[PDB]
Amino acid sequence: HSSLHPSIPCPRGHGAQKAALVLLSACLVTLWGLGEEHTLRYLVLHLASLQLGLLLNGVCSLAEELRHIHSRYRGSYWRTVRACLGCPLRRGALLLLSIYFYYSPFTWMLALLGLSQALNILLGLKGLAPAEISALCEKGNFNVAHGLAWSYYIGYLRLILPELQARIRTYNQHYRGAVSQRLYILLPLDCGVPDNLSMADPNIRFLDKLPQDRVYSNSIYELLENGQRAGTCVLEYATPLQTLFAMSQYSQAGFSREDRLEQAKLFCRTLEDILADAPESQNNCRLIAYQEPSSFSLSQEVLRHLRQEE
Amino acid sequence: HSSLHPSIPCPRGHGAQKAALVLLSACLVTLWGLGEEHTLRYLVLHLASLQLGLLLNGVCSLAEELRHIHSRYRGSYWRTVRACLGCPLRRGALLLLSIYFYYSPFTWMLALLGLSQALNILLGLKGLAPAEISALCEKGNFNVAHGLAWSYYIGYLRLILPELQARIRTYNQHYRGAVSQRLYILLPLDCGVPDNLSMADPNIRFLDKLPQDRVYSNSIYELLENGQRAGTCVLEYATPLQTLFAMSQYSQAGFSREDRLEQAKLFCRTLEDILADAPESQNNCRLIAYQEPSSFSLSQEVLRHLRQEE
């Protein structure tokens, strides 16, 4: 229990599976009504016919995973097969057990299963309950990309992006000076965010403040390509990406450097979708989702996005 | 597509179900090998035997949902049955269609299904693929309770809670004055957060600052019970709860006042679990998860938690 308020739900315990012992016993107190007996033969010759269906679902869902294998699975085939089917060790042990039992019209008996499992997912019947949907979604304690993208747009973006173009031209009309039309939001996929950008590259080393209630001290950085001013624009890291970084450095929380490469591949995607919904903000700021491999320099890919403005 | 970087995965399209048309056609180009024919009879007399299993799973999972019906479903029985089974209109239409077809050993034929669906969830075979687990979890754009609880503990709690007891005794040794041992974090379940607490109740009306790099201007409030100082403690609202409030006032985002009563019933739970993991913080701050119904006064339930300290 330990609930601080009666409205707040306790986490879901094992009350679901302990009712299955009752359901298992209820069909097994029928045993004398069953015994007078090849009922163990028809159990595994039925549980094969479910386990082909989950196998045929993993085959059919593998066409979707194949499109995103490189982005999601770094170009590896074996991670895609593991993601498509799951843990087949508990399943395949029931496969090879069922081979012996029907050994003790099979070409038709596969033709019914592939026909059934096609219609079972084409008419949308492969769909859980809203309890089971909210069971596993409450199970993962780190589902932390939507809560960080939306806290960044509500918290920091929508409070600074309408008033940004005012401070751009004011710093431009004070200067002489050249200022980029929109703010640049860097998105390091490795989540390594330094507090200063002057050590991220020697090219970026610069600082300036801007005039404007809510004190937001944005910083303009100069991109010094081969010792020459190739572009003066405002750049700022993603503040939720330090949150994903500091969660991996919270070793009590089971947050790896691989979960940190999933949410930072998702928060960088959902933030584009949030900025695509707001009309003015999509033309107000540009996201740079740079990832450190090989060697590179991030001052080029800023200037990839900066030169294409004009 | 529209991907800003090749590592970032595009959202999952309909490539999964369009491969099922191939699987449906592959078992249906076997038709002359099937036709020479009651194969439509054995399709629905098989798809009943899957649809009893999903029905028997919803019956068995209903024992778990019943424990949390009041907290999750406000004490309503019909919302619990809808959450346990889902949308039975696409399923029950295949139920009553299958009644006519076997009409055109049933007591045993139910005894095998309840035996099978018990073992199918007791040996953990009711378990999806990590693609399908990450399919629906990417589908809900508002999974925003873990991303707000963890951004509050990493961002604001762990930066102010170690240095809190220093500022409590310093404001106490400057005074005369009585200060509570730990900071109080209010959690309004209706997400209605005013910028001042003096209008939340007339009892709370007070303000003070505290001495201390990171400027965090906490505010101490006096609880004036019947015009008398019943307790002087520091109280502050949940800043992620204004985020859940402002998302509902973003009408382009499909965020209702019912989703806002799920994440604010979850962020208030996960924040307790995060503070339970950190050893010093659990004895450093106390969460008050008050919910406005009926009439009430929140200055009492602060003093419920304040008087029990000593």
Numbering used by the authors:
A (entry chain B), B (entry chain A): 3 to 38, 41 to 108, 116 to 186, 191 to 227, 237 to 317, 321 to 337
Q: Paper's wording?
A:
Upon binding with CDNs, STING translocates from the ER to the Golgi apparatus, wherein STING is polymerized to recruit and activate downstream TANK-binding kinase 1 (TBK1). The activation of TBK1 in turn activates the transcription factor IRF3 to induce the production of type 1 interferons (IFNs), leading to the spontaneous immune responses. Further structure-based functional analysis confirmed a new STING activation mode shared by the agonist and the SAVI-related mutation, in which the connector linking the LBD and the TMD senses the activation signal and controls the conformational changes of the LBD and the TMD for STING activation.
To test this possibility, we then resolved the cryo-EM structure of the SAVI-related mutant V147L at a resolution of 3.65 Å. Second, the revolution of the connector helices in the mutant was more obvious than that of the HB3089 bound STING, as indicated by the larger inter-Cα distance (10.3 Å) between residue 147 than that (8.8 Å) of the HB3089 bound STING. However, all the three domains of the SAVI-related mutant, including the LBD, the connector and the TMD, showed overall conformational change similar to that of the full-length STING bound with HB3089, implying a shared activation mode: the connector senses the activation signals and controls the conformational changes of the LBD and the TMD. First, the contraction of the LBD in the mutant was slightly smaller, as indicated by the larger inter-Cα distance (47.5 Å) between residues His185 as compared with that (44 Å) of HB3089 bound STING. The intrinsic force of the connector of the mutant, which is somewhat correlated with the steric hindrance of the connector residues, is enough to drive the structural changes of the LBD and the TMD through the revolution of the connector helices. The revolution of the connector helices has two effects: avoid the clash between the two residues of leucine on one hand, and release the intrinsic force of the connector on the other hand. Likewise, the 3.75 Å C1 structure obtained from the SAVI-related mutant V147L also exhibited the asymmetric vibration of the outer transmembrane helices that is similar to that of the HB3089-bound STING, substantiating that the asymmetric vibration should be the intrinsic feature of STING.
